């Protein structure tokens, strides 16, 4: 698969006021940094995981974790 049905793209602006307990070092080892960006496949209704593609592979992670991140949209 070559992402799934593109809506927008979010890229990683960088890490939200709300990050703690060096979970910066966390994400970084999940390779979570700004400058980075999202390509939206889907969430789920019932609450959160995030499909994602980034260039040639798709990622997941919860709503709790993209609680560290700052996300700003293309658009």
């Known amino acids: 698969m070559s992402a799934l049905q ?25 390779g979570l940094l700004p400058g980075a960006a999202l390509r939206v496949v889907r969430i789920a209704p019932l609450g959160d995981p995030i499909q994602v593609e980034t260039r040639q592979t798709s990622l997941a992670l919860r709503r709790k974790d993209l609680a560290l991140l700052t996300l700003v949209p293309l658009d």
Request: proline share 8%.
């Open 6 to 30: 593109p809506s927008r793209s979010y890229r990683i602006t960088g890490y939200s006021p709300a990050i703690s307990n060096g979970y910066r070092q966390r994400l970084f080892s999940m």
